[PDB]
Amino acid sequence: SMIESKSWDGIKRIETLFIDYLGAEDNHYNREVTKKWMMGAVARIYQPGIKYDSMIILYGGQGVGKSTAVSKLGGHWYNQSIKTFKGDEVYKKLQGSWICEIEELSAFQKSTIEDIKGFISAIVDIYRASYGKRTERHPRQCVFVGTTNNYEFLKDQTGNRRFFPITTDKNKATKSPFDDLTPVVVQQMFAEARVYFDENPTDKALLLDKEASEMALKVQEAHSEKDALVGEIEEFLERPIPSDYWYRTLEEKRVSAHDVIDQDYIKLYGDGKLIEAKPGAYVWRDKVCSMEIWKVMMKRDDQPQQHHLRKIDKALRNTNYCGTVKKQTRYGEGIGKQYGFSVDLASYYKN
Amino acid sequence: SMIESKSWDGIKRIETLFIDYLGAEDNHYNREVTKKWMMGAVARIYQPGIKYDSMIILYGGQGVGKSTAVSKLGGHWYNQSIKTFKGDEVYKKLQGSWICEIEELSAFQKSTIEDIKGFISAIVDIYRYGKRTERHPRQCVFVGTTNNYEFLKDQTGNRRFFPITTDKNKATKSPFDDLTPVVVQQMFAEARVYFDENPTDKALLLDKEASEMALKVQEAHSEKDALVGEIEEFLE
Amino acid sequence: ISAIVDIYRASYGKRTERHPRQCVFVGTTNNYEFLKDQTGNRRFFPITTDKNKATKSPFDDLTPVVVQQMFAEARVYFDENPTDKALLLDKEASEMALKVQEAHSEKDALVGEIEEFLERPIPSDYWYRTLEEKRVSAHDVIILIELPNAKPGAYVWRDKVCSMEIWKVMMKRDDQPQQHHLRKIDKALRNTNYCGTVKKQTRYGEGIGKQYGFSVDLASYYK
Amino acid sequence: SMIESKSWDGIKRIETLFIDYLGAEDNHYNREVTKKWMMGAVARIYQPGIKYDSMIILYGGQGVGKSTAVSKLGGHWYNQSIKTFKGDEVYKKLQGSWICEIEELSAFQKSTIEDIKGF
Ligand SMILES: Nc1ncnc2c1ncn2[C@@H]1O[C@H](COP(=O)(O)OP(=O)(O)OP(O)(O)=S)[C@@H](O)[C@H]1O
Ligand SMILES: Nc1ncnc2c1ncn2[C@@H]1O[C@H](COP(=O)(O)OP(=O)(O)OP(O)(O)=S)[C@@H](O)[C@H]1O
Ligand SMILES: Nc1ncnc2c1ncn2[C@@H]1O[C@H](COP(=O)(O)OP(=O)(O)OP(O)(O)=S)[C@@H](O)[C@H]1O
Ligand SMILES: [Mg+2]
């Protein structure tokens, strides 16, 4: 009834919603993502089972007004009680809720990425009523928008395509959500969203544009917490190692791997190099092991725990030089016969 | 109804399920384990309370279409909304589910692996307005989809998790366009035929050589502990 | 604290009802630095009480008549403008409240150390140096162009800062940092006024490699 | 009902159960322990309070079929649910099971010496 209370005027408000109410930059990504979120909300109202695994995340200052803007859009159906993603109670809390706010991403701290994906991407809520006799099977009519104050809130890098961060700034806000997001204005926003959705009512219409998706990937990486080990591993792997390197003891292996030459002095020919008998003296690395990284690159002597090599293996896989399958080979006196990668520096030395 | 909606003509689709759709290897282990998985699914449908503790696990990139292929196989009765595996209410989440998929985005904790072992190991569920209504069937068959290459930690979990390595650019058929309800129905009819040739749980087990080289695969997908080699070098 | 509605189902209830929050919160503390947030604490309003400066005693003088009179006065003031905006503090009160909240909050001592480290001029060839050379040159104490008792342009202002550069050069630590160390260094860098807020990938050196870092602008410092 | 469903013919297959099905050596210790284990199983299903502190641990390769032999022995009453000896959850998973299997002795890794000895 609210959506159809008034016909849309034609003012095109939803695209610049967070742009001029919260100060988000006037990118194509922001416009597309806010438009798609509004259409997704209207779709979940009109098609209660429609698929939608996206969610907006609003980053900004303490006083910018993110929660107030979400509350105005939610109105009576706004939800502020999703503090966890586990248990059967939250699905009951999503009954009369349409716009749901993961305030401060509090649930994120408690939950795991799999739980977040399962909660966001669900379609139905299977639970019996308090006094009913039969399970009710309510479709999921709620759409999720989270607000945060921490810049680097996406700690994981495996599943992050769902979250679309938006960077707000109070100084950039032309309007104010406190007195300008009147119920008539949100009604006119949702009317426009309904018009756009009706232009093509399908679950694929809620996906982002190709250019919008291309910026979305970059923004998700910019808001994702990075691993600084992979850069160090890559720099260590890019060092030419002398020929007959695996036949040296560990003590001289460390000094050979820690004699660093500038990349201008390589004087390469694709594979051969004269670092200034010289052409064959040094050669690119052919293999690397997690234990070799532990003992040679980090100059460690204590026996490493399992999680250290788990982290080193993750870093080596994230490295663009190493593959993904591990082969068993002898590495040296301190490393022994180990499962290691086959580093191929083809991406490197193409300079 | 769907499995018996149409009989099975001779096409031999059961063996090359994940090979030509997810770019797996044309290996005897892959064919045998995919065939046994489909037979286990149709057996759990037909002989509801059966002993089938195996679990296909698919490894691949972020977009090889393993979850899409699993959803295409499951249809309406595909399930992914299972994230915790210990407790009592979990058995309620299995009511309308046939193919349950466990997706591992980030690395599972050591407890979660034991939880999924003890979950897929069950063959019966108990729920409830009288007579305790023991939901004996347990028609569910489980498939996991993992992002990390090395997902096996314990030696206990081996011999029950059957990993399959899925690659891209080598898949003959696209899972987004070629897994249609007709083809999956024909595959399940073929599985019905093969399982009905020997309706027993012993028929769901792998071939002897298939199992012995499944041991090799499970070793190739497990953590290495990296210390036996150093001790060997010290001893040498 | 900021929540306005609680959605939940009562003990003997039919549905998960929405309950507007009719309660107002006050806290009493004995610790001084009780605010543990460094980003901001606008909602909290620390009031520093002190006995021997109390002209009246809450144990004897706060009779229910007195509190009823206080709440009647509050109702009068609110009814002068029955709006949420009326509840907001005065423009001067807000400016003083910002200072009070930062006074009663916990401080990140790493931020000052980071800022001091970034203020040291570095040799023009700083990035084309060994890690030990970087530790030697950066750790010395040192008229946009500088003359630290040398030729002009031998020392310039820093333009890139990495968390691993902080970990390896400023702290001079050869230990491999846990992710919680680099998270703290990243927060310290973001709270720095010289440092920006968006990280861009660039290669730093032999021990650091190609890693995401900030472009640092010392315009505030040398001016 | 199953135990006395059919009388016992004098075949003498109790003392060599693990000997000729799992390949254990033909020691006197092996025969005695497996015979006493089966006698204790029958006792505990007949005299529920009987005191039987023993439990047989089958050590062997990963293909000898220890779990298979144990499951065949147990029948519909075989249990592999137990994973730890801490709390009342183990007692609640130990009620409807005649034979309980400590898979890979995982519980032994997750519990103290005193806890496993008491349980
Ligand atoms: N009626 C109002 N008129 C103007 N400003 C208001 C009003 N109500 C609250 N504010 C101010 O708006 C800011 C709080 O708005 P919120 O929606 O809580 O912002 P937020 O950025 O979501 O906050 P957090 O703390 O990050 S959840 C504070 O500066 C308040 O003083
Ligand atoms: N026509 C298409 N339809 C659907 N997805 C497509 C299509 N073309 C490419 N894709 C991509 O294929 C992937 C589909 O994979 P999913 O089934 O959603 O999850 P997945 O393949 O299992 O990967 P993970 O590691 O589990 S998230 C997504 O990354 C899509 O962007
Ligand atoms: N028909 C068969 N004949 C012989 N061996 C078989 C046959 N079917 C399966 N196996 C093997 O028997 C083993 C089955 O494992 P289980 O039943 O748990 O017994 P197990 O050998 O103790 O294994 P674990 O890991 O120690 S519990 C696997 O090694 C299979 O390869
Ligand atoms: Mg807020």
UniProtKB/TrEMBL annotation, chain B:
Q: Which residues form the Virulence-associated protein E-like domain?
A: 3-222
- Annotated protein name in UniProt: Similar to D. nodosus vapE
Q: Which organism is it from?
A: Staphylococcus aureus
- Classification of source organism: Bacteria, Bacillati, Bacillota, Bacilli, Bacillales
